[PDB]
Each structure stands twice: as C-alpha cells, then as structure tokens.
Amino acid sequence: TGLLDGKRILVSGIITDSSIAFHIARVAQEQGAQLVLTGFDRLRLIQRITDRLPAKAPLLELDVQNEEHLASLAGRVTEAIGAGNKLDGVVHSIGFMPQTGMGINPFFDAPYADVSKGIHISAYSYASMAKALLPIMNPGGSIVGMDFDPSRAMPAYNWMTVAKSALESVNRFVAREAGKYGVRSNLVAAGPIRTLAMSAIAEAGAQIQLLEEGWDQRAPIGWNMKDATPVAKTVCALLSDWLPATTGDIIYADGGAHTQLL
Amino acid sequence: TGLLDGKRILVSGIITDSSIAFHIARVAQEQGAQLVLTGFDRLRLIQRITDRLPAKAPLLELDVQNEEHLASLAGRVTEAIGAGNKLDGVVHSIGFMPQTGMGINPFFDAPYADVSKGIHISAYSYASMAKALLPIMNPGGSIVGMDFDPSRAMPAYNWMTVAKSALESVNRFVAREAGKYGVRSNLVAAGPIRTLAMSAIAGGALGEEAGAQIQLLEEGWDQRAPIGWNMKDATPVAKTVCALLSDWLPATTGDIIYADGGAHTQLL
Amino acid sequence: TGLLDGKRILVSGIITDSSIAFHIARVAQEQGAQLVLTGFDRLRLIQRITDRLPAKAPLLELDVQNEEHLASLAGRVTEAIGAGNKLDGVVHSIGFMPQTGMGINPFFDAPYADVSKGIHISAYSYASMAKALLPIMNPGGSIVGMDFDPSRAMPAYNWMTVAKSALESVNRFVAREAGKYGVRSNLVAAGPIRTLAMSAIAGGEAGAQIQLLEEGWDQRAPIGWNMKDATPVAKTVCALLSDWLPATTGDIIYADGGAHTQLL
Amino acid sequence: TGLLDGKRILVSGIITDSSIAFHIARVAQEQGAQLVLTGFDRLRLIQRITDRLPAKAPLLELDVQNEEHLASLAGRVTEAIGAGNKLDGVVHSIGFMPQTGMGINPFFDAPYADVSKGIHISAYSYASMAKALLPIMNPGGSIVGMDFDPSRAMPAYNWMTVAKSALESVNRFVAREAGKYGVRSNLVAAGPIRTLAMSAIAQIQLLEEGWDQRAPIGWNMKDATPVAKTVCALLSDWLPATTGDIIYADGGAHTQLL
Numbered sequence A: 001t002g003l004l005d006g007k008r009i010l011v012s013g014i015i016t017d018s019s020i021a022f023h024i025a026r027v028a029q030e031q032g033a034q035l036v037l038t039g040f041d042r043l044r045l046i047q048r049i050t051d052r053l054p055a056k057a058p059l060l061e062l063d064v065q066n067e068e069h070l071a072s073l074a075g076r077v078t079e080a081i082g083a084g085n086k087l088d089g090v091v092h093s094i095g096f097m098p099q100t101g102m103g104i105n106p107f108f109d110a111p112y113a114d115v116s117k118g119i120h121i122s123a124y125s126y127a128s129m130a131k132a133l134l135p136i137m138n139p140g141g142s143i144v145g146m147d148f149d150p151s152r153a154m155p156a157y158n159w160m161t162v163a164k165s166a167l168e169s170v171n172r173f174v175a176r177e178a179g180k181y182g183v184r185s186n187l188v189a190a191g192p193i194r195t196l197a198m199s200a201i202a203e204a205g206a207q208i209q210l211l212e213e214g215w216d217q218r219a220p221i222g223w224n225m226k227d228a229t230p231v232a233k234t235v236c237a238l239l240s241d242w243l244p245a246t247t248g249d250i251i252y253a254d255g256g257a258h259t260q261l262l
Numbered sequence B: 001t002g003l004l005d006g007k008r009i010l011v012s013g014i015i016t017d018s019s020i021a022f023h024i025a026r027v028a029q030e031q032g033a034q035l036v037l038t039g040f041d042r043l044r045l046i047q048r049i050t051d052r053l054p055a056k057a058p059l060l061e062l063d064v065q066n067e068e069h070l071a072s073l074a075g076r077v078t079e080a081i082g083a084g085n086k087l088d089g090v091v092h093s094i095g096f097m098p099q100t101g102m103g104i105n106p107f108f109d110a111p112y113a114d115v116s117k118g119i120h121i122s123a124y125s126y127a128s129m130a131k132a133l134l135p136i137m138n139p140g141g142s143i144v145g146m147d148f149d150p151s152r153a154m155p156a157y158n159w160m161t162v163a164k165s166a167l168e169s170v171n172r173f174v175a176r177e178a179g180k181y182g183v184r185s186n187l188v189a190a191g192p193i194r195t196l197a198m199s200a201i202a203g204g205a206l207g208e209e210a211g212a213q214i215q216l217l218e219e220g221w222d223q224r225a226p227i228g229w230n231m232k233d234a235t236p237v238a239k240t241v242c243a244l245l246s247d248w249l250p251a252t253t254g255d256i257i258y259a260d261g262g263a264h265t266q267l268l
Numbered sequence C: 001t002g003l004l005d006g007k008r009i010l011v012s013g014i015i016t017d018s019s020i021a022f023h024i025a026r027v028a029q030e031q032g033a034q035l036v037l038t039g040f041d042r043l044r045l046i047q048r049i050t051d052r053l054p055a056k057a058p059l060l061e062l063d064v065q066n067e068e069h070l071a072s073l074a075g076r077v078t079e080a081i082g083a084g085n086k087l088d089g090v091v092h093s094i095g096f097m098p099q100t101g102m103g104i105n106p107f108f109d110a111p112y113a114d115v116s117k118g119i120h121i122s123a124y125s126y127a128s129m130a131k132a133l134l135p136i137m138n139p140g141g142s143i144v145g146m147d148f149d150p151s152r153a154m155p156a157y158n159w160m161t162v163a164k165s166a167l168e169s170v171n172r173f174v175a176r177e178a179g180k181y182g183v184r185s186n187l188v189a190a191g192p193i194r195t196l197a198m199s200a201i202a203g204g205e206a207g208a209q210i211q212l213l214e215e216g217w218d219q220r221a222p223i224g225w226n227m228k229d230a231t232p233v234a235k236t237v238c239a240l241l242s243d244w245l246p247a248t249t250g251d252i253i254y255a256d257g258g259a260h261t262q263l264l
Numbered sequence D: 001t002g003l004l005d006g007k008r009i010l011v012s013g014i015i016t017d018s019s020i021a022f023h024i025a026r027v028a029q030e031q032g033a034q035l036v037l038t039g040f041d042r043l044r045l046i047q048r049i050t051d052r053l054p055a056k057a058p059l060l061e062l063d064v065q066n067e068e069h070l071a072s073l074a075g076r077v078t079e080a081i082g083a084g085n086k087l088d089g090v091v092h093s094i095g096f097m098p099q100t101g102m103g104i105n106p107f108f109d110a111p112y113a114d115v116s117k118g119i120h121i122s123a124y125s126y127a128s129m130a131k132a133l134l135p136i137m138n139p140g141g142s143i144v145g146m147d148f149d150p151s152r153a154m155p156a157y158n159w160m161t162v163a164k165s166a167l168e169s170v171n172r173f174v175a176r177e178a179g180k181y182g183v184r185s186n187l188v189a190a191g192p193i194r195t196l197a198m199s200a201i202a203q204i205q206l207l208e209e210g211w212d213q214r215a216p217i218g219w220n221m222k223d224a225t226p227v228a229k230t231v232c233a234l235l236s237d238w239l240p241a242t243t244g245d246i247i248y249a250d251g252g253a254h255t256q257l258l
C-alpha cells in the first residue's frame, strides 16, 4: 500500500512545519519510506519540528557551503541507516538568496558576492550533494530538487530567478552523472507556497499578491498557495518507481499555470 | 494497496500486444484498475489480443472519425461500467498518418486530404474523446494522451510531427475544459518503442536513405538518454502513464511528461 | 542604400490597408524591393488598396485551397517579374478560422470540417506555397510567415492556437526543404495588431478577454506595445527578408515587445 | 546606405582577430558605425589587433570583475565619444570558465570558486555592464550579448552551460531595466566558431560535421560573418519590437533533431 515502501530517502531543507521539505517528509513516511533528515544552522529547533513527523528519523547537520560537512555526509548517512544499506532517494529542498537580490531592491544593485552566495546554495549545491550521495545510492534510485519556473522574468524574484535557471542547467548535468549509477535526477517546479522563505521574499507585496492571484486564475485546476501536499505528492511520485524513464527533467506541480497565458 | 485500485479507466488504442496501449492496460490492471477498452476496425482480432490481459474488460467499438460512435460513446461506457458509476481515467493512445505524409515520401507531396485525416485521428480526436467522456468522469480524474516530442523537426516523421504539435496545443485547451470537472489532462511523450506503427515506418519503404536516418535517430535515444533507452520495453512508458492516471501527480495538467530516458534534455 | 535593394519579393495577405501584409509591402518598397502581390477572392477591391502603396506591383489571384492556383503560381509569377529573374523572398501573411473555432464558441463544439479548413489555410498553405515558389527562388532567399505565440493556451484564440502550433511545426520542415535551395524559412510571432481578422475573433464575453490580453501585452512588454502600429512587425519581417539574418532558419523571431519573455 | 550609419556602439571581447567580437566590430564599421572598444588583460596586444579593423577606434580597458573599471566606464566612454554624445549600442562578447569546469574534467570536481568566477564574468557581467552603460544610452538603443544554447546538456561545455543558462535569465531582467531607457536587450545564440576560447575547451572537426549536418542551411565554423551580421541586425532599427529575447544564429541547427 506504500508508494515508497522500503525506500531509504535523504530529505534536506526542513526549517519549519511549513517547509515543503517537511511535507515531502511527512508524505514519504506515510508511504512507507525510511528517512534521514538534514538541517542547517538551527538544529536545535529543527530537531524538534521533525519530532512532529509521523515517525522518527535521524537528523544530520548539513551546511551545503561547508566542505567538511559534504566530505563527511556520506559517512554520517551510512552510520545512520546501517552499513550495508544505501539511499534510494535524495531530496534537495534547499534555497537561499540575500535580501539585496530580491524584493524591491534594484536588480542592478545586488553585489556579485551576494548573488554568488545565492547561486552557491540554491544551484551549485544540487551538484555537490549529488557528488556526496551517489556513491551510496542504489540503482533505480532518484534525486529530486525543488524548482520555481524561471523561463520568464518577473518582479521580486529577481536574482533567485537566475539561480533557478542555473539550477535547471545543473540538473541536466547531474542526470548525466547520476545515470552512471542507474539513478535519476529531476526537479519539481512548484507553484507559490506560503513558507518561511516565501515570507522573506518581500510595493513588492503588491506584486507578489498579483502573481499569486494570477496562478490560481491561470491554473485550470486552481492553485492553493496554502497547501503543500500536491507538491509533496509530486516529489514522492518522482522518488518512486512510477516515473522510471524520466531524468534531467522538470515536472511542473503548479496547477498547470505555466501552460496558460491568461 | 494498488496504485490504481478501484479506479475505472477507459483505454483506447490496442491493436496488437505490442501496442503501447496494451502495456498501459496491463500495468493498470496489475495495479487494481477496472478497464473499459475501445478498439477500431478489427474488433474481432482486437478481442483476441485483449483476451491476453490479466483481467476481463469490455471492448467497445470507437472510430474517432465516426460521429455516431462518439455520440453514443458515453452511453455505451455507462452501460458497461453500470449506471451511477463514472470513469476516473481516460487514455488516448491513437495515431494515424497516411504513407504520403511520412517516411521516404517528400514532405511537400502529401496532399492536404491525407494530412487532414492524420490530424483528425491524431490530434482533433483528443478533444472529441474529451468532449464525449468528460461528462461521465469523476473529480480527481485524469485524461492522458500519447505524444512524440515535435519541438524539433527530424527525418521521416514529417507530417506526423505536425500532428503531434497540434496534439500538444489541443491538450492545453482540453485541460481548460477538463478543469471544470476537476479533471486533469496531460500527454506522455514516449521515446521510440517497437510497435506495429513504429516498425512500419522503419521497415516502411525504407531500405533507402530514410532507412539509415531513422535507425540513426532511434539509436541516438539510447546514446543521449542519461539512463539508457530500450526500444523493446514499453513498460517504462506504461508506468509513466499509470503515474498520471493516479493521484500522485495531482497538480499537473495541460502538460507533457517525458518518458524517454531523459534524451530530450541532452544535445549529445 | 535600401535594406531590400534589388530584391524581388512576393507578398501574400493584403485585404485592407490595416493588413499586416500591407504594411510589410509598404516598408519593403520603401527599402527598395520589387514586389509581386497575391490576393484572395476580392481582387478588384484589393487592387484599389494596393494602389495606395508607394509603387506598382503585379497582383495575382491566389486561393491557397485551390490546387490550380498553386499549380500555376510559379509560371504566373515568372511572367510578372520577367525572364531570367527569380524571387528572393516570400511572405506568407495568411490566416483563417471559422467562427466556430474562435471567441465564445465552446472549444469542443467546433466540427473538424471547420477546424480543418482553418488549419489548411493557416498552416498547411505555408508548405504548399513554399512548394510552389522554392523552384523559382535564389540561393540566399528568404521565406517568412506570420505567427502568434501558441506555446500556451488562452481565451478566445481557441482552434487558431492549434493552427499556429501546427504552423510552427510546418515551418521547421519547410526550412529542411528550403535549405536545399539555400533558402531560409522563418516565422514572425507578432503581438496583437488591430486588423480585419483581429476584428472577427469575437462577435457580440470574448471581446472583454481580448481587451484584457491587449492591455496585459503593453504591460508585460519591457518596451511597451501599441496594437495600432503594424510598422515594428513590418520592419521585423523585412529584417528576415534581408541578408542581415543569414544564419537563422526554421525559427521564430518574436516581434511582440518582449512580452513573451515576462510572466508579469 | 549603411545599416548602422551614425550610431555609436561599444564593443567588448576582442582578444584576437578570430574573436566573434572582432568580426562584429568589422561588420559594424563597414555599416557606418562609430565604435568604442573595450579590452581585457592583453591591452597592448589587443590594440595591435584592433588596428586591423577597417576604421580606427578608441580602446578602453575593462575587466568586468573590477568594480573600479565598471565605476569609471561611463565617464571614460563619454570622454571618447565627446560630451553630449551617448551610445546607441552595446555589445557583450565576453566569457570565461576555468579549465576545471570544462572538457573531460569531471563535472563534480569543479570547485565553486572556479564556477563562481565563470558565472561572474560570463553571466553577472552582462547585468553589471548594462548598469554602467544604460545611463549613457540613447532611446532606441540596443544591448546584445553572446549565447550558446544551454537548454540541453552536452559533453565538454560542462559548467559554462550553466553560466549560459544564468546569462539567459539575466538578459530577461536586463530587458526590464533597459525598457525604462527605451533600450532593447537581446542575445545571439551562435553556432560553433573557431576562436581562442573555443580552442581552450580541449573531435574539433567532428563537431563542425555534426552542426553543418543538422543545420538546414549548413554551418561554417571558420566564418563568423553570419554571426556578426546577426548582432548588427539587433543593433539596427530593424528589430524594434524584440527584447529580453534570443536570436539563434546557428544555421537552424537548434530547430532540428537530426
């Protein structure tokens, strides 16, 4: 009855119980998956938000800008799931951009240092996580990252749009590497979801508002910006065996908004 | 406990046991779905092939160019699944293009009457099946059609490519209509699979120039696909379609899912 | 001096002086092109309108659904431009969709016979025109058709959207053929322009939603958009007819103010 | 008579006379444009090379990673074209990626500092150059960047593919900014051309065969002129409704699977 039955999956990116990662985790566990979680910085609070998941799961520290964490990550994951076991799934649900690269801050005024930090964490880290975790993944496995359609420019998102454009490209190359291990690599492009990070993006509020209302309007089946579950289920679909021929790709979990002009 | 358990699903397009629709049907039954089948022309022969499926399934006649078949379709489906029951799934796995519109035949020499028949059967019928069946579909339901990536031109496929481009555009509009029934509409873009249709194009008149190009095309899929592509295995495609028939892609509509080994994401 | 100096170019699609084709012809003539025009159905009326262009141009009858018109087109064009001369450019600026395939008419209620006539005129005719004219075109020549971005679905445009998706695909195959003659094939995807065909998309609400798209277009466009000025689109078509886009084929150039590149 | 007659256009990225920017500059001058050129690193050699252009032109130093070069750029440009005169066109023909992010070097072994430098020079600089130069550009003006279609992954191009993907995203936001000045921003995605940087990536003639094949009108790696003319097209008044966009000067190869 479990879609992810018997699969060992690493899930990064939980910060609150609003986090897309948190809901990915909950739905995965409901579908029989065995998880390992990773958190950044506030492991104290995170450890406790994750206590509210349907089942218990080891929590490892991972700062994707930290070379030492990455070098040790595979070892620490192995310790947590038991030697002789490998990952079946990896969820990258990590993103960051300094305030200067978002909101009403002029596009031209974000210093490259700030952009580079945003691109490091939001795009490059998809590959560096892949580099760490592929040596301990089973054939038939699946890596899934979170995307926000960057095909067109828009207000407020600014340099985070550029980061997602890089991430989409990095994804297609990770797929080439991941293919050597019989592993898939894909992105899920979600509609706007009210999260902690969503909260930080913000005149700029007027625009975000109008964008959101637009999404629900264009989407032929509507879009509930307060429900993370359909996005969570999409990510789990990709972690399962039921999309076995899809890789280097992007699945849109956006109510179909991107397929409609008006 | 099965992916499609308790779902009632119509599956069109079986003609041989190599048909993509045959494998869609088999995997759906393995996952607990209850099927209605539609078939065109050689119904006696199709019943023998559908007899090979794991589970029983009623076989209705449907020529998508027949207005009466389409007008009577919903009523014949209702009769087969019992009144008060609706469908949760529809699979469109139907294609046709006259020989003039494909293969070694010069692109410019396909008469429009031929092209128009191909587009009717291959693209327009997705809308008219949706029109006939949406009134007997449940919310949360899902329509799926079969695609072959037409974003770039290529040898041989010729006017079928134009048909598929039209199909993709039709799908985005079918999704607006289906939206009102709480129903999703998507396409699955498959890599090449060895079916009646496909072998017919290579074996076709090819044994000439288009022959080598087609084979070069086919062998390129496996080469570009980061995880490989096996033309003799339709199951990765059937599963993907089942994934769209299920509740596990609930926020995807008007869209295309690529079941091609990731080949379309790679230039070499 | 002129961008199209010495080029001989066929332009289809003029019905009124609001026609995109009319403005293409004008700018082409201002830039030194010698034109052959083709018109459908109302030829005496069309001559009255093409009289208003800066220069003379033979007017041929061409109904793209008429195999005999296509069969004779090359011969007739060759007589208009004189012995030893060939075409350098062809403009397809032709479209049609019956009222069932557009506006507030339900998408599902359009019979295939109507949809098929629309696709015949709007997409397939691109290929049969290239078929007719490629044998009398010069290496380095250019064929251009008019497009409206169909990558996403939208209110009112309906089955014409499907026709344009077909056209884009046909263009990529026409480029394969044209390339055997050294000829380019491309489309121009224009933003909304106030023409006769545009008038007919609604009826008597579709009119509302079209105004809504209209207003959103100028908004989305980083350089804005004026639906009453065909000239930027005309210039774009002339750019492709010229030698200044010599490595572009089977492709689409967007003359839409950049609107398609912006979400909001 | 000339397509760019009387327009003032800045062209960056010349390093040898095979540079795509060299040929952009040559064709632009042949079309009556008045140029300002910028150069990186080998200024003395570059000067030697721009002497081979059809007309003389001011050479200014610009390392796009140098905040002071960027801060002074507009002033130095106005000094060259004379106060009261503004630019009509800007050409960005600049890129770089460390050898760890390219070739047969494993994708996963390129350190972020290497990737970050490449993105800085190849993607961010398009924005930062526009920020410097938009305040001194005329309405009707045109900014043009060089692209290599990154919509699909491929061998060897590796992390530069990612840079190009970012560049395409950046171009779309620059267009938002440039619209306020009545200025357009677009990219030219070119087919492969035999340049110095092309040489740095390492079959090199095996690549020319494939492209030429797929291109319905063929493709010559030894000829940058069709790419130059395209850029000059975007600099002209003849594509006045195109912005935030990409024009493919690749022989049509990206429209074809085989």
Ligand SMILES: NC(=O)c1ccc[n+]([C@@H]2O[C@H](COP(=O)([O-])OP(=O)(O)OC[C@H]3O[C@@H](n4cnc5c(N)ncnc54)[C@H](O)[C@@H]3O)[C@@H](O)[C@H]2O)c1
Pocket (backbone or CB within 6 Å): A012, A013, A014, A015, A016, A018, A019, A020, A021, A039, A040, A062, A063, A064, A065, A092, A093, A094, A095, A096, A121, A146, A147, A148, A189, A190, A191, A192, A193, A194, A195, A196, A197, A198
């Ligand atoms: N919420 C949306 O609408 C939406 C839409 C599309 C895509 N996304 C993407 O989904 C992913 C998750 O974002 P979210 O919406 O759930 O917000 P979130 O704030 O809940 O999660 C962001 C996560 O990034 C992590 N982060 C920042 N720096 C990190 C670092 N050095 N190392 C490890 N983790 C770090 C945070 O700890 C945090 O857990 C992101 O990639 C986001 O861009 C979100």
Ligand SMILES: NC(=O)c1ccc[n+]([C@@H]2O[C@H](COP(=O)([O-])OP(=O)(O)OC[C@H]3O[C@@H](n4cnc5c(N)ncnc54)[C@H](O)[C@@H]3O)[C@@H](O)[C@H]2O)c1
Pocket (backbone or CB within 6 Å): B012, B013, B014, B015, B016, B018, B019, B020, B021, B039, B040, B062, B063, B064, B065, B092, B093, B094, B095, B096, B121, B146, B147, B148, B189, B190, B191, B192, B193, B194, B195, B196, B197, B198
């Ligand atoms: N085989 C491949 O490699 C491949 C790849 C991508 C997409 N597709 C698409 O998959 C779908 C099925 O094709 P296939 O490969 O399984 O071959 P197929 O020959 O088994 O399927 C074709 C089906 O369409 C039906 N058909 C033709 N005319 C019809 C009509 N008037 N009414 C109803 N049905 C009609 C046939 O009866 C037949 O069952 C098609 O849409 C095809 O274009 C196939």
Ligand SMILES: NC(=O)c1ccc[n+]([C@@H]2O[C@H](COP(=O)([O-])OP(=O)(O)OC[C@H]3O[C@@H](n4cnc5c(N)ncnc54)[C@H](O)[C@@H]3O)[C@@H](O)[C@H]2O)c1
Pocket (backbone or CB within 6 Å): C012, C013, C014, C015, C016, C018, C019, C020, C021, C039, C040, C062, C063, C064, C065, C092, C093, C094, C095, C096, C121, C146, C147, C148, C189, C190, C191, C192, C193, C194, C195, C196, C197, C198
């Ligand atoms: N107006 C816009 O906003 C817009 C935008 C994008 C693309 N387009 C396209 O531009 C092209 C020209 O359309 P328009 O906007 O100038 O309107 P239009 O009404 O002026 O042009 C339509 C033309 O198609 C011709 N036509 C119809 N049936 C024909 C047939 N059998 N044979 C030959 N010609 C036939 C008409 O005679 C007429 O000259 C069309 O392809 C249109 O789809 C228009």
Ligand SMILES: NC(=O)c1ccc[n+]([C@@H]2O[C@H](COP(=O)([O-])OP(=O)(O)OC[C@H]3O[C@@H](n4cnc5c(N)ncnc54)[C@H](O)[C@@H]3O)[C@@H](O)[C@H]2O)c1
Pocket (backbone or CB within 6 Å): D012, D013, D014, D015, D016, D018, D019, D020, D021, D039, D040, D062, D063, D064, D065, D092, D093, D094, D095, D096, D121, D146, D147, D148, D189, D190, D191, D192, D193, D194, D195, D196, D197, D198
């Ligand atoms: N040659 C091709 O096949 C091809 C194809 C498509 C796109 N492009 C792009 O065209 C543009 C020109 O490349 P090219 O092939 O002519 O190679 P090139 O080596 O001749 O020119 C590249 C330029 O980048 C400049 N560069 C590197 N770092 C710089 C810095 N800090 N500041 C300023 N300039 C710097 C070099 O000085 C050099 O002039 C590039 O953007 C390239 O990515 C090239």
Ligand SMILES: CCCCCCc1ccc(Oc2ccccc2C)c(O)c1
Pocket (backbone or CB within 6 Å): A094, A095, A096, A097, A147, A148, A154, A155, A156, A157, A160, A191, A192, A193, A195, A197, A198, A201, A208, A211
């Ligand atoms: C125009 C604004 C877009 C609408 C909301 C969608 C969204 C919300 C949150 C996202 O996560 C981040 C955004 C910026 C920086 C960091 C993160 C994790 C994110 O990547 C996308």
Ligand SMILES: CCCCCCc1ccc(Oc2ccccc2C)c(O)c1
Pocket (backbone or CB within 6 Å): B094, B095, B096, B097, B147, B148, B154, B155, B156, B157, B158, B160, B191, B192, B193, B197, B198, B201, B214, B217
């Ligand atoms: C030229 C490239 C070779 C690979 C094509 C793969 C393929 C195979 C069969 C397909 O189905 C049809 C194709 C044409 C006509 C009818 C059908 C069902 C189809 O649509 C696609």
Ligand SMILES: CCCCCCc1ccc(Oc2ccccc2C)c(O)c1
Pocket (backbone or CB within 6 Å): C094, C095, C096, C097, C147, C148, C154, C155, C156, C157, C160, C191, C192, C193, C195, C197, C198, C201, C209, C210, C213
């Ligand atoms: C909601 C959509 C409204 C904006 C569309 C702009 C437009 C205007 C006219 C066009 O030409 C035709 C449209 C339909 C049928 C025939 C033609 C030539 C055309 O193809 C596009």
Ligand SMILES: CCCCCCc1ccc(Oc2ccccc2C)c(O)c1
Pocket (backbone or CB within 6 Å): D094, D095, D096, D097, D147, D148, D154, D155, D156, D157, D160, D191, D192, D193, D195, D197, D198, D201, D207
């Ligand atoms: C994988 C196929 C081979 C690619 C050939 C085309 C090309 C050649 C040179 C290019 O310029 C650069 C490439 C890398 C780093 C820096 C520059 C300027 C460039 O961006 C693109």
Ligand code: NA
Pocket (backbone or CB within 6 Å): D212, D213, D214, D215, D216, D217, D218
């Ligand atoms: Na070729």
